[PDB]
């Protein structure tokens, strides 16, 4: 279960964050570390489509090769805090799993600037009991975390040394597919 009520960045600039570009997860912290320790790759595109706030997600396990995409329409809880009901789709936007009540994630933008961000996310999916997940994002897939985001992590009373990096996972991303999914 999730246990944190993350606080959104004061003065969060929604237009800059939801500009349709891609964000790559470079480091993450799972508060409920599973028993199965494996590498992982994730990226997302957030933007507006016909006035609606949307988010496209990509998950890739470099070991098992398990891959999946998701598209969600976001609902606003407050500035910087959203609730997303996701639908699983293929890379072309074709629906594989329709939106289902009870299947959603929340996400809070704790810090963000033109190239980096720190977010908190709580996933709710079926019977699986998931926990809080923090992620450091960057507009560049190979960028080391800068002083700005590292300080934000500290300011949130978190220890960056505990975060797991995805840089050595040999990740590959289909940016074009991610961007196109925003309209699906
Ligand atoms: C950047 C923020 C992320 C968001 C918003 C997010 C969101 C989600 C969503 C919505 C699903 C369900 C997809 C579906 O069933 O169609 C999912 C599943 C999953 N995510 Fe993430 N994720 C993110 C980052 C990550 C990262 C970095 C990891 C850590 C390695 C991760 C590991 C997983 C795993 C293992 C599952 C499968 C869980 C299951 O179905 O049993 N996610 N994620
Ligand atoms: N996740």
Curated annotation (Swiss-Prot):
UniProt record similarity statement: Belongs to the calycin superfamily. Nitrophorin family.
Cofactor note: Binds 1 heme b (iron(II)-protoporphyrin IX) group per subunit.
Disulfide-linked positions: 2-122, 41-171
Coiled-coil annotated spans: none
Keywords: Disulfide bond, Heme, Iron, Metal-binding, Oxidoreductase, Secreted, Signal, Vasoactive, Vasodilator
Record-listed E.C. numbers: 1.7.6.1
Tissue and organ distribution: Salivary gland (at protein level).
Biological function: Heme-based protein that delivers nitric oxide gas (NO) to the victim while feeding, resulting in vasodilation and inhibition of platelet aggregation. Reversibly binds nitric oxide (NO). Also binds tightly to histamine, which is released by the host to induce wound healing. NO release is pH dependent and linked to loop dynamics.
Enzyme class label: oxidoreductase
Subcellular location: Secreted
A biological-process GO annotation: vasodilation
Co-factor(s): heme b
Miscellaneous section: Superposition of the structures of NP4 in the presence of ammonia or nitrite shows a conformational change of the protein upon NO(2)(-) binding.
Keyword Metal-binding: yes
Main location as per UniProt: secreted
Protein name, UniProt field: Nitrophorin-4
Binding-site residues for heme, renumbered to this chain: 59
One Gene Ontology term of the molecular function aspect: oxidoreductase activity
GO-annotated cellular components: extracellular region
Catalysed transformations (reactions): 3 nitrite + 2 H(+) = 2 nitric oxide + nitrate + H2O
């Amino acid at each position: 279960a999730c246990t944190k009520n993350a606080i959104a960045q004061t003065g969060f600039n929604k237009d800059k964050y939801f500009n349709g570009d891609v964000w790559y997860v470079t480091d993450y912290l799972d508060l409920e570390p599973d028993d199965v320790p494996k590498r992982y790759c994730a990226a997302l595109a957030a933007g507006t489509a016909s006035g609606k706030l949307k988010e496209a997600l990509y998950h890739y396990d470099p070991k098992t090769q398990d891959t999946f995409y998701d598209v969600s329409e976001l609902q606003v809880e407050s500035l910087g805090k959203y609730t997303a009901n996701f639908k699983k789709v293929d890379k072309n936007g074709n629906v594989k799993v329709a939106v289902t009540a009870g299947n959603y994630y929340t996400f809070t933008v704790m810090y963000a600037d033109d190239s980096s961000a720190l977010i908190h996310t709580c996933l709710h999916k079926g019977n699986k009991d998931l926990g809080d997940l923090y992620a450091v994002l960057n507009r560049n897939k190979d960028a080391a975390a800068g002083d700005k985001v590292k300080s934000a992590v500290s300011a949130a009373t978190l220890e960056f040394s505990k975060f797991i990096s995805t840089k050595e996972n040999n990740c590959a991303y289909d940016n074009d597919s991610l961007k196109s999914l925003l309209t699906k």
